[PDB]
Design a protein around this nucleic acid. Structure first.
Ligand code: MG
Ligand code: MG
Ligand code: MG
Ligand code: MG
Ligand code: MG
Ligand code: MG
Ligand code: MG
Ligand code: MG
Ligand code: MG
Ligand code: MG
Ligand code: MG
Ligand code: MG
Ligand code: MG
Ligand code: MG
Ligand code: MG
Ligand code: MG
Ligand code: MG
Ligand code: MG
Ligand code: MG
Ligand code: MG
Ligand code: MG
Ligand code: MG
Ligand code: MG
Ligand code: MG
Ligand code: MG
Ligand code: MG
Ligand code: MG
Ligand code: MG
Ligand code: MG
Ligand code: ZN
Lengths: 116, 52, 136, 66, 76, 177
RNA sequence: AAAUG
RNA sequence: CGCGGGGUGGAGCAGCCUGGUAGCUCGUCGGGCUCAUAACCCGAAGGUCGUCGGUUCAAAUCCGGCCCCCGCAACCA
RNA sequence: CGCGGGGUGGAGCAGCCUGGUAGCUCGUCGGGCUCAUAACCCGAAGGUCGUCGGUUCAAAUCCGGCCCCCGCAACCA
RNA sequence: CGUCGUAGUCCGGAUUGGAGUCUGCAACUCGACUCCAUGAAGUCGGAAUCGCUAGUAAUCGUGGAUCAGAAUGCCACGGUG
RNA sequence: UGCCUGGCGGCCGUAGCGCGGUGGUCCCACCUGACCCCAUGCCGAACUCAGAAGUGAAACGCCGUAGCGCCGAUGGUAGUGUGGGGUCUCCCCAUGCGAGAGUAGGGAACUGCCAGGCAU
RNA sequence: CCUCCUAAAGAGUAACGGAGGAGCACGAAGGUUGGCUAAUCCUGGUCGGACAUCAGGAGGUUAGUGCAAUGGCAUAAGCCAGCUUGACUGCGAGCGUGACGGCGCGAGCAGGUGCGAAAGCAGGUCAUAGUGAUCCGGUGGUUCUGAAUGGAAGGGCCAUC
RNA sequence: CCGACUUACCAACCCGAUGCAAACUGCGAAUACCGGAGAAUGUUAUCACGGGAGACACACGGCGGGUGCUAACGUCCGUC
């Protein structure tokens, strides 16, 4: 019902991205956690992935489902991408409103050096 | 064919004008649109005028 | 006289009447009158046949009319030349292919049913045959 | 909720004939004085007497005595 | 009669079929709706006319949950 | 909020005792209370609708939405998108407060009140009722009002069965029959 | 102004 | 399109005719009067005075654009 | 057979003119007038708009079919 | 003397529900009257039409006959006028 | 490595419904609160943020189960290209192609990449 | 002129063959960003009834598309809201369709713009009707031309009636 | 006033079974058509450009049809 709606919201942009042939940064937010993964244009494989579910990121933070945490995740993924040589991406906000935590993560990524 | 044709003239001072249709009965007020003046090469305001 | 209540279209193309029929078996009744010949039964004809058979069966046992005159046939008025659009719908036909169970009947002895069908048959334009309920 | 579009909503004291004191949030503004409340209302007490079907035989007996 | 009218034929349909090597911009399908959908390296026009966005071979395929005909161009 | 507090400790407990529920989340709760004024007389003149809206606002501390015709019907002489009714949806603390008002004050003020309909539940928990007079609420002043009007209250709950909903309402000392 | 029984 | 003239209570016409100013013919109601419909009087409801802006103390009255009705000649591929 | 026009209470007419609205004259009914009737005066009622379908939210009204009427045209050898 | 202050009202009383009283063998159809409740229509009436010239019209009450009981009718009587 | 969970795909019903059961350490979901970021043509319902007392009730996931959906042969039938024939509105023969429907049956998906939890 | 069928599964294909529409509309009904999902039915609910408005379930696009028909449409092309003029100017590889006149689709490039955080999208509208060649004239722009020369008139070129 | 109820009555929705459709399709051929590769054969048979035309009344037969009466040496298309 809700998840389905979110998927519906997301999919138009996703299709467009696919038809561009873009290496997309896919974010996923839950009330408790935030997930980020850079996915190749083929769609079948991911390059780098960072989340608050990971023990390295979680141990540093106070609470995992907050704006600061999101920012941290964004930075982390971006650094990984840089290391892997992934510079240019497209932000797949995945049905979520570009606002608050998502937005924060994106901005952090931008700050780190991901070109989007 | 109740929709009369009108001539949007540039505020830039150039003789350039676009042309278009407008239903004058439902819309008495003048049409203003920011359109590209190809002579100045800028997006300028184009106020409505009579086709004459 | 059977005729469609409503129609999608008032007139219809001539078409062709080739192939074998689909309503081939005695489904509802015990006995049937299967069309051997190819042709087209009008609504009138069908009605006549029904009248013939009901009387024969003396309002005893059920009759089904498996065919329906759903195709309108146009006739151009007399002394009118060949142009000027399609003629008006005069009568309605069911196109009949060989194998068509036309009528079905139950609640009757077999001989009587046969007799009834024979009576009916003379009213119809196509050559026909008596058939029975078959297991499988 | 939205800042300006809504009517004023503040806690008021709703006095009653019961002696019951009821602090409630309302759009009234001033202090409220009630006639009846849920505890007061004759639902449990009234509705038995309020129907009053009775009987004719008893009435007959009462007034004539034979 | 009230019947003698019919419009000029629009010459629609698939113009370039499967395996047919085309130049970019070549119209693959003229159609009314999206009877065929634009896949990889195929653009959709304003009248839903599918055209090649790259040089290569036409590749018709059935894709997606709605089982729709997608035309892609594969590069040679 | 008092009634919410009551629910939190007592009503839930009562429900558990009665239906023998496995989960505490399995218990019914009142999701929303929806107030509506259908105002057909608004097509003749706009001000009546406004007045109705104001009344609604006075009744329940929220500013009402002005609902519009889903489809045009000639039988009532209305076109699509005609401002025909007004509606308030109450949720949370405000809703609770409204509920408290309704039972502790407003229902008692109903003229010739001999109970509420027990067989009025839609079949899946959600209760509905309607008042003939808006003056039963102490928010509306008797002298100020020009036109007599009413409204429908719709108590929507999480209850799967109507019986459960009924039970819940009883647990909140709802009048019934 | 005003026909008839 | 160019030019001229008009938009006046429910209708048409005066008041424009160089600002200081809502009358005419009916229409409607009510009253008096008649056998009365009427004739006739008295009394009243009924007009961003095409629309808007400007000059000015003061405009329907002057002017400018704009809208509509009419007339005018004019060519009209 | 073709092209038009129509069917609206008892009757004869309107409206249909760009869809939402039922009007006029006579008649009918109840009073009053006269000894009574007529005329006259007052007050009322009365219409699924030939019929059946269609489309707009909605049809007397627009479109189509069918029934009935009224015109016209139904020709050259 | 006080009150109501132009409202469908402290106007108006119809109608209905309940409780009664009396007359009478007997008050269902079908009496009058009382009490409590209830509180229609009606804001001076279309065409038309009636009475009255003085203690008259208008208005206010009172009595009698007929009568077990049962008058806004009838026949009378006075007041104001 | 094995099971479980989350994300992104491929695939597009042998994958979908239905009925029955099941899971909360983690995850996911509902959830608690909202002065603030932001939000409601009213409403913290949704969107959003700050959170973690409670529960898996709903949802979601998993396991089972032929009430359906779905897939589905072989054979036959229809049609039909070419040639030939007849009783020629339709047929038949030779030769090639060969359905649709139905039947036997299958069938409660399969699978890739990354991440987390618990195990060995 | 458009849609369907006739039309024989590419295109096309006739008849006084069978059916229907157009001679527009819209400064938003265009652009974009963000969000949303329909018809109908049942049950409950003041006035309120077969039919307004409010709930909830069933239902699953049977609805919608500014209008005919066909093909499309949930990624919605359907329905809301914010901000706006890309209903841009110059071009245009390459195609499609026409005997031709023509008509149509078009990625990308230059300039300049709008929406979006960004990727991106935007050269009118879901698409297919809504239209008229040439001549002759009318208006605006343009030093292109200018009959001895300077001007001008007239002509041309671009826009447009 | 809510109505109580039966009886050779017509009957929407839904379920089971039966057909029909040029303007129905949850299916779907044969042919045909478009494109690529290979072989033999064919007087280049193909395309382009230029000189010259004629023709634009067709007829019947076969197969697929519209119209007509599944009439016509009828009529109008498609195809050989
Ligand atoms: Mg068949
Ligand atoms: Mg007449
Ligand atoms: Mg009219
Ligand atoms: Mg008389
Ligand atoms: Mg009407
Ligand atoms: Mg009254
Ligand atoms: Mg006496
Ligand atoms: Mg569960
Ligand atoms: Mg086979
Ligand atoms: Mg098969
Ligand atoms: Mg399953
Ligand atoms: Mg074709
Ligand atoms: Mg073909
Ligand atoms: Mg969108
Ligand atoms: Mg749009
Ligand atoms: Mg549109
Ligand atoms: Mg369109
Ligand atoms: Mg000429
Ligand atoms: Mg010179
Ligand atoms: Mg077909
Ligand atoms: Mg010729
Ligand atoms: Mg010829
Ligand atoms: Mg020929
Ligand atoms: Mg033939
Ligand atoms: Mg011969
Ligand atoms: Mg022939
Ligand atoms: Mg011939
Ligand atoms: Mg023929
Ligand atoms: Mg031939
Ligand atoms: Zn109290």
């Amino acid at each position: 019902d809700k998840k389905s709606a979110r998927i519906r919201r997301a999919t138009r942009a996703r299709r467009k991205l696919q038809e561009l042939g873009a290496t997309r940064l896919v974010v996923h937010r839950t009330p408790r956690h935030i997930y980020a993964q850079v996915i190749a244009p083929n769609g079948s494989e991911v390059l780098v992935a960072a989340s608050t579910v990971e023990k390295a990121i979680a141990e540093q933070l106070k609470y995992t489902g907050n704006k600061d945490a999101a920012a941290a995740v964004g930075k982390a993924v971006a650094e990984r991408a840089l290391e892997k040589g992934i510079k240019d991406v497209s932000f797949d906000r995945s049905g979520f409103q570009y606002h608050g935590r998502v937005q924060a993560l994106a901005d952090a990524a931008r700050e780190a050096g991901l070109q989007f | 064919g109740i929709r009369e044709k009108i001539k949007l003239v540039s505020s830039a001072g150039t003789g350039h004008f676009y042309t278009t249709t407008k239903n004058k009965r439902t819309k008495p007020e003048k049409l203003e649109l920011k359109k590209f003046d190809p002579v100045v090469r800028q997006h300028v305001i184009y106020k409505e005028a009579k086709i004459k | 006289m059977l005729q469609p209540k409503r129609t999608k279209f008032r007139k219809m193309h001539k078409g062709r009447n080739r192939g074998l029929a689909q309503g081939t078996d005695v489904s509802f009744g015990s006995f049937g009158l299967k069309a051997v010949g190819r042709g087209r039964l009008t609504a009138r004809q069908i009605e006549a046949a029904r009248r013939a058979m009901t009387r024969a069966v003396k309002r005893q046992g059920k009759i089904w009319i498996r065919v329906f005159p759903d195709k309108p046939i146009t006739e151009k008025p007399l002394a009118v030349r060949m142009g000027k659009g399609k003629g008006n719908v005069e009568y309605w036909v069911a196109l009949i292919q060989p194998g068509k169970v036309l009528y079905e009947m139950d609640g009757v002895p077999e001989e009587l049913a046969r007799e009834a069908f024979k009576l009916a048959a003379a009213k119809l334009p196509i050559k026909t045959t008596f058939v029975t309920k078959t297991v499988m | 909720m939205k800042k300006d579009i809504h009517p004023k909503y503040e806690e008021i004291t709703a006095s009653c004939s019961c002696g019951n004191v009821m602090k409630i949030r309302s759009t009234v503004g001033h202090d409220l004085n009630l006639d009846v409340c849920s505890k007061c209302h004759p639902f449990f007490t009234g509705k038995q007497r309020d129907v009053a079907t009775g009987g004719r035989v008893d009435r007959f007996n009462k007034r004539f005595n034979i | 009669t009230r019947n003698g009218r019919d419009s000029e034929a629009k010459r629609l349909g698939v113009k370039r079929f499967g395996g047919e090597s085309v130049l970019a911009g070549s119209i693959i399908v003229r159609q009314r709706g999206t009877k065929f959908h634009a896949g990889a390296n195929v653009g959709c026009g304003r009248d839903h006319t599918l055209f090649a966005k790259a040089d290569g071979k036409v590749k018709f395929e059935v894709k997606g949950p709605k089982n729709r005909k997608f035309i892609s161009i594969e590069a040679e | 909020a008092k009634l919410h507090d009551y629910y939190k400790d007592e009503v839930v407990k009562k429900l558990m005792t009665e239906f023998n529920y496995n989960s505490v989340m399995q218990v019914p709760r009142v999701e929303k209370i929806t107030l509506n004024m259908g105002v057909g007389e608004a097509i003749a003149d706009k001000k009546l609708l406004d007045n109705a809206a104001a009344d609604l606002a006075a009744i329940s501390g929220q500013k009402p939405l002005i609902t519009k015709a889903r489809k045009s019907v000639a039988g009532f002489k209305i076109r699509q998108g005609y401002p025909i009714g007004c509606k308030v949806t109450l949720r949370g603390e405000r809703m609770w407060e409204f509920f408290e008002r309704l039972i502790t004050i407003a229902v008692p003020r109903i003229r010739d009140f001999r109970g509420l309909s027990a067989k009025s539940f839609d079949g899946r928990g959600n209760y509905s009722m309607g008042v003939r007079e808006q003056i039963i609420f102490p928010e509306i002043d008797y002298d100020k009002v020009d036109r007599v009007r009413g409204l429908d209250i719709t108590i929507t709950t999480t209850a799967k069965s109507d019986e459960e909903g009924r039970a819940l309402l009883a647990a909140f000392d709802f009048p019934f029959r």
